[PDB]
Design a protein around this ligand. Sequence first.
Ligand SMILES: [Zn+2]
Ligand SMILES: [Zn+2]
Ligand SMILES: [Zn+2]
Ligand SMILES: [Zn+2]
Ligand SMILES: [Zn+2]
Ligand SMILES: [Zn+2]
Ligand SMILES: [Zn+2]
Ligand SMILES: [Zn+2]
Lengths: 95, 95, 86, 82, 253, 254, 98, 97, 107, 104, 97, 105
Amino acid sequence: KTRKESYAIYVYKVLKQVHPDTGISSKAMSIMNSFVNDVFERIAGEASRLAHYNKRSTITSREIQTAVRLLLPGELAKHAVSEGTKAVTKYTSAK
Amino acid sequence: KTRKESYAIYVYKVLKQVHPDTGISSKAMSIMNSFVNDVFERIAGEASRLAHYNKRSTITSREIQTAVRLLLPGELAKHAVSEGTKAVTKYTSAK
Amino acid sequence: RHRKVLRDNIQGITKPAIRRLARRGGVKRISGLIYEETRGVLKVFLENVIRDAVTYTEHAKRKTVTAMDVVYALKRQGRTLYGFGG
Amino acid sequence: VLRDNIQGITKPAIRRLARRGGVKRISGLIYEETRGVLKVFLENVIRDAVTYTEHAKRKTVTAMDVVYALKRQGRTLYGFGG
Amino acid sequence: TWELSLYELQRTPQEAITDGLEIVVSPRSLHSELMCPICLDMLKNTMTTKECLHRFCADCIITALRSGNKECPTCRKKLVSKRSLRPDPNFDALISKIYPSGSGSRSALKRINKELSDLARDPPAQCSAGPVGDDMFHWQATIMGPNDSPYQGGVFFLTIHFPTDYPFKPPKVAFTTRIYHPNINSNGSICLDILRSQWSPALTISKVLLSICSLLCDPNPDDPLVPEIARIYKTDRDKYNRISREWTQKYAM
Amino acid sequence: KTWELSLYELQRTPQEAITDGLEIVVSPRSLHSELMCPICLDMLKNTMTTKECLHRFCADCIITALRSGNKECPTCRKKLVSKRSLRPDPNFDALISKIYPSGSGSRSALKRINKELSDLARDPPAQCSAGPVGDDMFHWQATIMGPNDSPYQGGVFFLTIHFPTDYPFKPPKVAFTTRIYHPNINSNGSICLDILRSQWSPALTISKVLLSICSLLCDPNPDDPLVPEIARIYKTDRDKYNRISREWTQKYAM
Amino acid sequence: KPHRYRPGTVALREIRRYQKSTELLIRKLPFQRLVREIAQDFKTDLRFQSSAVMALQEASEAYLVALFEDTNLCAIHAKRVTIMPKDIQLARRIRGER
Amino acid sequence: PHRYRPGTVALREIRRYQKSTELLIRKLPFQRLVREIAQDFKTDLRFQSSAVMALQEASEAYLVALFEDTNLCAIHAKRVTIMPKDIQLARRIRGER
Amino acid sequence: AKAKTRSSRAGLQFPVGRVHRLLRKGNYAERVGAGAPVYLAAVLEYLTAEILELAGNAARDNKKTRIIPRHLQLAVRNDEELNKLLGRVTIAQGGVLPNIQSVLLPK
Amino acid sequence: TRSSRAGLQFPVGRVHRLLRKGNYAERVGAGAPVYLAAVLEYLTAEILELAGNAARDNKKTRIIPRHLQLAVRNDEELNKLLGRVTIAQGGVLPNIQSVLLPKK
Amino acid sequence: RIKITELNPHLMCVLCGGYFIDATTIIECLHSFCKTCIVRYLETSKYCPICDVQVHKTRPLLNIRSDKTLQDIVYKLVPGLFKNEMKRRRDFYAAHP
Amino acid sequence: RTTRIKITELNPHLMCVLCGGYFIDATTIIECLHSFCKTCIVRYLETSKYCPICDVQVHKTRPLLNIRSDKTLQDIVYKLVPGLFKNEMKRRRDFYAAHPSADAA
DNA sequence: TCGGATGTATATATCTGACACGTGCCTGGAGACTAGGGAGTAATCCCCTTGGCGGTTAAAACGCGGGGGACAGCGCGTACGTGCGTTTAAGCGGTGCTAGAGCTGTCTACGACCAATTGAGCGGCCTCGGCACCGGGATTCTCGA
DNA sequence: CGAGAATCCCGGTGCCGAGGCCGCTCAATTGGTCGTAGACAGCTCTAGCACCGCTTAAACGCACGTACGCGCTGTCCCCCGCGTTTTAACCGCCAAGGGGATTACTCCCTAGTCTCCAGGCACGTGTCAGATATATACATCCGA
Ligand SMILES: [Zn+2]
Ligand SMILES: [Zn+2]
Ligand SMILES: [Zn+2]
Ligand SMILES: [Zn+2]
Ligand SMILES: [Zn+2]
Ligand SMILES: [Zn+2]
Ligand SMILES: [Zn+2]
Ligand SMILES: [Zn+2]
């Protein structure tokens, strides 16, 4: 059948978290999916270029953070870095 | 020192090919270098995305050619393609 | 063994259609020389996009241009499109 | 802390830029506007440049940082590297 | 700048009152300090603007930024999103401490009545407004001509219609009294930026009427409704004052 | 479309080649316009042909024409983005080599001036003239009279022509020094002619310029005039201009 | 005798009408024919996915509307309420397409 | 005495500065401006001469590119003098605000 | 040995392991840190939430309990930062912002 | 060398090495760096040619960045290729609008 | 009527250990301090003395603003605080030029 | 000065490779600058999309988009070859001398 | 100055289908592990950024006469909007035909990879000629009559 | 026509950066095993293409007319040009030393790999969100 992966269930979970009594259309679902994919490619790309610029062969959380600082504008970047740091810290603690 | 390299000698050679009695300054040479590197990264990048889009893990001369067809506009593409198809032919006449 | 050559379909884009697009664009009054210009611009845009798309198609050794080819073509022109994949 | 320095972009300099841009007559409220635009531009570039400098853990802003910033901003610059 | 003064450099701390002291409070005391300028009621889920430190209710400021300009409702400064704000725990906890009752509904009608009380308690200068009868959405206003402007003792009548999405949409304010003015229509329509484009959800009828009086004091010949009047006001000044005083002594007095 | 063969074309018989060894006589002006470079006014050399319009030029000529000026065809104004929009034509080179074995490796810029001078003296345009004041060929004096059916009918108008160093890649500076009351003709001497400013092509000659001015005298262009005072003079319209220009210019010429 | 709006009301009504809608404006089949006509110069006997044509139309109409906004701005900038080819050409020029 | 018509020597200035390739903005105060702006991101910064030169090249290029579009916006409104609204329109269509 | 997901340990919803895999086999680098996937997943999840929130608001405004592309468009094009982020992005079936110039308004 | 075997001046080997790193793909074709170096050599040749002519027109023998700018901006294809590219010490093409020319 | 012994920490400065004298809050965290307190505090550390959140990258003074809305509450709640402050201020400025 | 040369020496530059005769209504493919008779190359491009001589692809889909009427060349072959124009015109007149349809051809 | 003809905002019955959740399933993610190695980090050579005389002079400021141009007012005129009648074809679906995308198993030619090893290419030194510099004078646009 | 700069042109000269040689380091070349991606014939079936009468929405055509593009024009005014005066960028350049480059080296961290298994997707199914439509009431535009 060749299953094709997607971010549907995840963005759905997020939707239930932020808005428990709202729904989502298939079109808007695909749009959100394409969005997350695009941002992923952007951040990962900039992080890759960051690793290559400094003669490094490893993309750490630092490259990702810097990439987010470069891509996302203003408060969006601030909250993004905040959530990222929170997540990597909570992950670091809980083995 | 770390032996910082460039496309200096090659650009100079081609310059003396197209114009025997014509020189070039340092700044202009650096600019030509930046051009070569830019076009390199662009073609190689588009070729990489090409290979990735078709689930193929190899960048052959085909991906490069298609990348050129996508990047270089008009006649600039055509001739270039020829100059490619020519070269890769001669390389297969002595290998 | 089936061929068909299409001609003068640029006139398919009608005057009231361009008018509607202009309305959505926020235009109150429209000149007469606007429509042909619009047809030309649309023709060029489609020329470029479809050219790149077909390039992607031929690179994939396919005789059918898919939606992803259009998406890639638009993306490489700096016009990313959500809602069709990618 | 540095001074205002936005007035460093003097009137005849902006006039020169307009001349090279092909401008015959210049208004009076053009200069301040130009200073503002240039301020925003330089802010946007230097921000990313300093970001690149910090990620490299350097206290000195290199030319390559500027080049990378401009390139990712969509204004590739030849004659410095990259 | 932030250069400390001669006293600030050696300022002595004020010791906190440790002894048991009870302080009687009133709803009119910390009224203006704890009132959301949008809904004109007690603060709830206090959100504070980062750039100007202005307190709003969460629902109020969100609905304001979603259904209007991206400015601060109080000082009109750039406010691109809720991320340009920050929740205020200390403030909200203070309010919930002093006022255990809390807040209620945030209907448009409730805020209209809040404006009614806000007018009855402290009336504006040479301005007034009140309901025509039982309906609270159909108001009538009265604006007396200011001293400086050539409309002395005019006492002009106005009509006010509140929309359902008040205050997130400006109320239809028009004139019922004939007045010779470049910014005022021959029917009664008013050319005021805060009544159309630059409306703020933190504005009240009082501030609007005051803006109209200020408009009478200094007309705006830039973008008028009646062109010839503006032309007369720009070219001459005697004819403008004369005709204005005539229309004032005929259609107003 | 536009390639559908007609009744004759669908069954036309081949024109058999003359195989018997007979010689052909050709004067050095027989294949002139067919083998002449529109730019340097001389025989073709290293022939380049435009892909869009099939127009022949010299290599260096058309390349330099592209680099310095509009990116269009000097002959038919059709656009070509660069030197890649034209392919080399070895056939013309071979034909020329067989017919005229004299490439003459010396072109521009005085030579084109002289050739254009011969082309000027051979057959001048309608009621016009142009020729160097002295020994210097870069400074010409052109005499243009009054064309028939025009408010300037009758009289004489002298003007000076300054040929640039990079001529004909840059338009010649034409200055009208006879004080004529014309919309596009400034009182100082400058002429607001589009083909002499931005719409200049290396395939243009002094003949075509003076002819353009000759046609300009009859029907001027009030769209972009040099002086705004005459803009209303043609709003009179064509009734008060024949009594104001024929008494200020024609009366000061004839 | 009959009822006629002043020339300007219906236009604004249309503007309010279509700025709220999201569905495509250009007819489907003619646009498809245009797409295939333009495509027949790159590859013979081309087959098109419906989603591909739809994507092309979405991007096309989006582009045209976006251009119409800037064009309108150019028209208003010259103290006019009517869009003219000069406006479109200026927009294209500044955007860096012409 | 000796005078020139308003718009002549200005045009000559256009023709003169379009031929040249040297930088226009004064170097030192521009550098001072750069160092002034950079202090809001990282304290005590050092700059390569090539970095400041790059910033100046990019800045002058950006401004001289903007002034063209501005000039076009001025001519489009049947004017020969550039105005703030022309810059605003230019940057608007450019897609910056 | 009682296995748990990396997303659960990071307190996220977006798949950490999947992001890590995509980074590895996405031709971005020879090696990738252990903080990169959790950080990236965190950022993606945050942006997702931030968009879905405003989209839910715009959906509530139109009296609809299901977010459509129009709501996403209304959410993004009003948020200046989100708009700058998706400036070169065209949202399908999203339409445009209702905006009429003051000059075109009736006299 | 592979450059000599392909009749190229640009380094096929260096291009191949650069394609190996930089994280473009897993494995790289054997004819790919030849083709790429060929394209780079072509573009370099074209630009250096046009700029050489530009240098000739300016009575110079050494090519300055100004000549590169003149060469690039006078070619619609090259200009499109370098649309978002700023050439240092290149200046702008001479251009004065028609309505700016002196009148009256 | 409520005991003031409970409303203290909402009006207590954690730098001087007293009531807010000319309140000044940090933008990024809304944590309130005294002006005379927090101005000379940020002469060393560019971080918050409570939540340890970075006030600003280089210049923290750009991210602090005077909270008159809060200071008014402090003055209206605490009996004879404004009078005391004014009295001490005048008494100090009495023996100085 | 007057030069004279054998016409057979000039024939290879004036003859069509498709019909073996002189160029009539010369038409040139532009991707390689190759000339043929109009009818010859038009009929040929319905059988092949590549050049008859150098096998270079005329066009990827529609070859007719890359052919142009070469007037100057036709003028050359009309001036060099004596009485060719008169003969061709005679053919055109004699053909429509019995067929009354479509004059402009 | 205002009430009636348009058509937009609004309300609610009602059938339709796509959103949404349950399920068997299968593969990708998790867990325990070793060891090569990129990266951390203290150490150290030394390039290049930074400060600051003071002395110059071209460049930047300030001011003033005034001429070209921004801009508000007005009017001849036509191009475009509004609305209804005629007419073109888009949109509908019903559906058979099959091109060709998609997946699978098999055979096999491609390229990374370790290794041996020599020159291609960069850091670096030096004579020299392109070119910036320089000043007398050719001369060509400009402004007034 | 004629005065007056001001760009261009021409012969001379001081200067430094372009170009060629050379020491030599290290990366490209030569050559062979082998895991494996890629070529490819083979095969299931989704989905694109042609078909084709029909209700009708919509494009089209056209007459009437008024808001609006456009040329014309008088008047306030604001940049232009230019001499004088004020100001600091520019330059030579020795000198303190931050700090970027490079190097020697211990080691934490991630690729690599076999296994267990549940998170994730394709599939199936019931119904509520919303499209739908008759039907209100409503805000809004405009002439006698
Ligand atoms: Zn509130
Ligand atoms: Zn505020
Ligand atoms: Zn041509
Ligand atoms: Zn020639
Ligand atoms: Zn804090
Ligand atoms: Zn304190
Ligand atoms: Zn033939
Ligand atoms: Zn051929």
